[PDB]
Write a protein that binds this ligand. Structure first.
Ligand SMILES: CP(=O)(O)OC[C@H]1O[C@@H](n2cnc3c(N)ncnc32)[C@H](O)[C@@H]1O
Ligand SMILES: CP(=O)(O)OC[C@H]1O[C@@H](n2cnc3c(N)ncnc32)[C@H](O)[C@@H]1O
Ligand SMILES: CP(=O)(O)OC[C@H]1O[C@@H](n2cnc3c(N)ncnc32)[C@H](O)[C@@H]1O
Ligand SMILES: CP(=O)(O)OC[C@H]1O[C@@H](n2cnc3c(N)ncnc32)[C@H](O)[C@@H]1O
Ligand SMILES: CP(=O)(O)OC[C@H]1O[C@@H](n2cnc3c(N)ncnc32)[C@H](O)[C@@H]1O
Ligand SMILES: CP(=O)(O)OC[C@H]1O[C@@H](n2cnc3c(N)ncnc32)[C@H](O)[C@@H]1O
Lengths: 297, 299, 297, 299, 297, 299
């Protein structure tokens, strides 16, 4: 009785997951009328089923958010037993606190619960406490282990983990612990805090948006005598001049995951993308059958 | 009062600017940008603590983007301690998805989203279905727009006119206008056929919304094909998506009358055309609502 | 684990349904104390069962509404697994919009959900959008097909479907499509709009309340040269002088359903009542077992 | 203020008219008819936008009809943008169904219905159970009615009196009156027996409600049968259903004292009887509540 | 799939129950940090299970209330299927009505539902209508039968049941009906109402807190010529000088239940404690398997 | 206005008394006792019907007792018809339990409890996590406390200073202070190691909370061990549980700076120490909030 659907955000990721678990993406239409309104029409009875919806609320965030919500509404109204959401990328998660502004990450939670979600599955939220913005169950998969493993495997010499900013220090520590390495941060107010001479430095953030912060960081590192420089993040937002900026940066290589569907029209040069499909696929099953999900950490 | 702060999001600023000027107030200062990211950014550069904020926004194309900024705004205001957050919606997008099989009822989902976000009340103009009004549990005032069009045509001084309902759902609206003008009604039983006398008459086609202009142009031509003196068309909401304009410019429609509830496509112009403003009405509605003077008086 | 109960509105309809599906109406007392308060006392354990309640909120609407709500409350408090409501006739559905008035159809929805309903099954609501006044699942059975079939079977000549008023046009179309006939409406402000000379006209509304609107319509038709006249509606409210007015009308025959229990003390003369028990009975099962309910349209 | 609009539904208009006159206000104008259909119709012919509306209604026989109109009224008002919708319930029907097996707790369901409909607050008089007060989450002020009856009897100047509790639940209420009159108490341990000295005494029977008058008449007669000087009976809520009147007119009760919280049956009259008004109290309660002057001062 | 947990209130009672039903108290830590905050850490996957929590909100009420709530939250967030609460002693139940005060018994209900409870099982609430403060199902076990049986068994002569105060009369009647005895009350404003000369009197209240009310009652009885005096209550709160006062009273014997864990440091002399474990144990099962719970009255 | 009623529960009365005196108001009269039973008793001896009540309470040790009385108070006030029930929390207990496995998120449960009880809004000071702010849906103003400490140190006129983050989460806070003082930052990468130049410097250790004083003392000593001119330490919330005091009195900390958000242990005194008051700030916050004057101006 398990049905999985993919909306428009990251279909390639969604089929990969579906194949790993072993089902066919649901028969559903997420269409559009002449104006600009979405017309969801579920092409099959899901009465009493456990439906999983896969969707990253990546660019354009508002459109993806709305179709997600409308789908939920369609499912709820159509008598699904559970409506479970799998969000590889939680858009608006940076707007998690306040001088005279909204807290969109919270508004979203509230919208999703209103719409009718039963539970949520997420990957590396910008702030781990966003988890508390919900009152329905939510499982938080972490993504650092994946990158750690790819780096661990690289066998680089005297490496140092670097936090591009003041909020990254925790994440940097998590990765520093894996590779058993020291940490240093970019005190950009721009300055380096910590020994980093002749070292292989790895820059890491949760999201690489405009690639502004990070490229500037990599160059400063080099400018301060670092053997070579790598950069990784979970969510490849790469908006604006991001690609051009990186292709021109000193970054030996950029490591990212497929939580967000890559821009088809512009390619990073030195680059590697790891998949998170295996991880989410495993969580679906484990949640669907009620097996320890904590077992994956 | 000085607690009447009014904001305009991106849907129809010209209309907003107008309703604010008419009222006699400066549009609240508010950063309503989008990050390059596409996510919506909001700064409200003016303490609104304890104020009564009115937000003006049509959820017209693109509906999902406008809906989201509206919601985010509300959230900003609620979190920033506004006293009341009142929504003025000249055009309620998704009002066509008002029932089901296995389909959603987006007009209802929206209501639910808006109340969740934190709205205090709503002001609307000609909803596709008057019962959408009941999808809310917060107060909502529903302004009719027919009177405005009625009046334009009345001063046109036409003779031998018949009001026409393009479809099976328009009959009520057609009646409202037929009354206001003391004219008979006829409908297009498109299954396509005319039901009622219309020979040599000046026919006025009326719908709440003119979207693709498909339904209506085809209607006008059929009228002509059935010997009607001349043909006019009106609606409140000018959605005009797709080939709408081209289709009308080529239609037999002597003239198309619409309101400025939805911001007109800047890049394509109807030829024989007239747009009436609904700013005076909403401005009036806001005032009455704000000071608690009867508004039923409009309706 | 399926239990069905009948309150006081339309017990004959309720037993018919119960027999079709195959169970015994629940052991429950819907009594009254000396004053005028209802005393519900469920004569059997329904702990963990799926309870279906059958009730039309017909005259007197307020009494029927209250017992329904009290029953729900009794069931909820007694640990039913699901409390599902089957409403053959949704009273107050005409009060679905606003000059300075309530929207009772919405207040009701809200009351029913507060009381504890799990879902609703309805037949021909005055306004299809009332369906959206709820946030719990609701299935809307339509009743026109039934009447269409009885008319289709009649083999009448050059028939025309007539909408007694400006709101009936949609319904009229639905029936016009069945019998493959043309439509005409009564533009009562009173006038006929459309060809209807020498035709067999069928008047149709969702409800025939005081029978005012409709009788006056039938006579006007005749007065405008119509071969003969029939009239149908789903819900036979027939309040006031309704019967007398029809018995005196020109209506060759009046077709109605048993959604509302007929006045025992006054009989229409030329008349036919079709049952909706088979339809609802089928919906119960299909909902209870989770089979496509959309399959019935 | 002029924002104190008061409405009366059908339960007890004489009482309502009185509380309005006392306060000094004209009862809000409101069509509160029923369609022939039996469904309840409502028009509120007077903009109440932004006003503070008080609704007066006992949910007495028929309880379900009165409950429904009350709810529909509230809905009308909420949808029509009243500022506050405050309910004044002289008699809270269903207060006897206050706990369970497989039975409902209607007093609670009601609270939940009233809040759902949209009430802002409630004012009540002698609930069958004081803890019903906790079934709400909106503010509720509970007026006691014993003081009123206490005072009538006090000025009667009787001697050698004993307060009697008709049953096991009345003992508290009996105490309240025994105190207010400095008298002893005795109860009817009906399982039927007297518990306490009562010989040659003037006994006063008191219950919150006198419904079928079954319990109480039988009590009075037993008292007499046990040598009591004379017997009086009082209660706040005169439900008097069934054979109540006949039973009392035939009882040994020298006199029955009640309040006008429930509208008296027009077609049958008690013989030896006295009705005290609770209008002055509620009127007072409304005023204090409305201007926010302490009301605990009553209680 | 049934798991039972015990928090800190009455663990002895909790194990007794667990043994009767047949399971092991859950693997969970209800710890404390240096400051004073509780750290709940559920030592095992309960995903999809039906969890029963046993806890009396006895002294200290606020601490016990908070751990209960935190546990619920932990369970809800951890995906329990149902979170069912067994409360042998409902603290704050005397604060059930209002001159300018809170109604804590109601605030509590609201807190418990917010936290995430599915249902409640309680024993002798101070006010039976507290039952209505909830909107989730609640089963109310009564405790008088137990004491009745112990008294019935005692074979005492011409006994009279006594209500220490004006609110106890109902409870007194329930017990008077068991032993087929008459009732009398203490009209303390202090006076006796009813014949009680040379009789064996049994004083009964739901709770014996400071033992003030009751000891003073017993002595008055004696002072009015009563053959001998016994006293019973369900909930042994015994705060303050309670024990000393009773040990010095004329009470031949005090009968109580183990709904509240007895003060380890001070012992009543003439005393008997009956267990309520068998009763609750039976309710767990019957609720868990959905069998008539009403069957136990 | 005279509708600014302020109450103090048991957490930090000296602070409360101060914020009330500063504002210029008499602390609302309210019995806030506990029965011998241990259950909390509440009488509010002063009609507050229609008033705007502010409650001051840190949910410091014992957290559960303070939380419960706060909730019960709110309940009392809500049931007693207060107009607004506004909470001032100098110290938000449980802010450390802000995420998960199989653990609760008590900071969130609390928010949910407070809103259920009936709060209208919240005023807080330096939450452990700024996003806790989003756990609420009622308005909440978050006051930063760094400015206060910044200023003390600024007037100390030190030279060659470095701000130090005891741990991986403090880096932001350290930056805020480094900025306000134009100093560099260094952190303790305790996995224990120093990251950044700190030789011969005057180091200031800063955390939001100093609980067991474990983390920080060990940090100060390591600094010294790495050749730092001298060492100071500051935090907003002085939890000082366990061996905290003893550990600091023995540490190398030249001086410890804290605020009075949490009431100091009466039985044990730090030696080299300075406590700054946050009363002026909250007092100011209350006023701005109450009259609806911008408060962002603080932050
Ligand atoms: C760097 P931080 O400590 O994560 O601070 C978060 C800030 O980034 C901003 N922000 C939120 N949405 C973002 C977006 N899409 N574009 C850029 N930054 C974002 C917000 O103003 C927020 O206060
Ligand atoms: C418009 P109607 O003929 O009164 O019936 C409503 C129908 O319009 C459809 N619909 C909803 N959104 C639409 C849109 N943007 N464009 C066209 N039709 C739409 C619905 O599927 C529904 O079947
Ligand atoms: C004919 P319509 O377009 O369905 O308009 C509905 C109107 O009928 C009225 N109405 C509602 N309840 C009704 C009833 N029981 N009696 C008569 N008409 C009703 C309402 O005032 C409502 O506005
Ligand atoms: C009235 P009591 O003796 O205090 O106990 C309450 C009982 O009255 C019953 N009851 C509820 N509604 C009633 C009514 N209208 N008439 C008589 N008894 C009723 C309940 O079933 C309950 O058992
Ligand atoms: C004797 P009663 O009729 O049960 O009245 C209940 C009263 O006892 C008081 N009360 C509540 N909590 C109590 C406690 N823990 N200590 C003493 N009495 C309590 C309350 O003020 C309440 O109004
Ligand atoms: C404090 P951190 O190093 O920023 O990470 C938060 C951790 O502190 C823990 N925690 C929560 N409450 C605590 C308390 N009172 N004392 C110490 N740690 C606590 C949580 O378990 C969580 O793992």
């Amino acid at each position: 009785n398990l049905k999985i659907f993919s909306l428009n955000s990251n279909p390639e990721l969604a089929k990969e997951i579906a194949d790993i678990v072993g089902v066919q993406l649901g028969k559903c239409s997420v269409t559009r009328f002449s104006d600009g309104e979405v017309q969801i029409n579920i092409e099959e009875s899901i009465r009493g089923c456990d439906c999983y919806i896969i969707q990253s609320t990546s660019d354009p965030v508002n459109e993806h958010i709305m179709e997600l919500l409308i789908m939920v509404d369609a499912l709820k109204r159509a008598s699904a037993k559970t409506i479970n959401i799998v969000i590889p990328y939680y858009g608006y998660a940076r707007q998690d606190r306040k001088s005279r502004e909204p807290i969109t990450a919270k508004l979203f939670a509230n919208l999703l619960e209103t719409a009718g979600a039963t539970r949520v599955i997420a990957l590396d939220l910008h702030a781990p406490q966003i988890q508390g913005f919900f009152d329905i169950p939510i499982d938080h998969l972490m993504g650092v282990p994946i990158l750690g493993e790819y780096f661990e495997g690289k066998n680089l010499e005297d490496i140092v983990i670097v936090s591009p900013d003041h909020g990254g220090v925790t994440r940097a520590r998590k990765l520093a612990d894996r590779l058993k390495a020291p940490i240093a941060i970019i005190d950009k107010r721009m300055n380096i805090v910590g020994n980093i001479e002749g070292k292989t430095a790895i820059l890491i953030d949760d999201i690489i948006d405009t690639a502004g912060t990070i490229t500037l960081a990599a160059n400063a590192l080099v400018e301060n005598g670092a053997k070579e420089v790598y950069a990784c993040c979970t969510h490849p937002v790469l908006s604006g001049p991001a690609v051009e900026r990186i292709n021109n940066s000193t970054i030996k290589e950029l490591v990212v995951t497929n939580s967000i569907k890559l821009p088809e029209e512009k390619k990073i040069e030195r680059f590697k993308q790891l998949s998170v499909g295996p991880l989410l696929a495993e969580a679906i099953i484990r949640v669907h059958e009620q097996q320890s999900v904590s077992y994956l950490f």
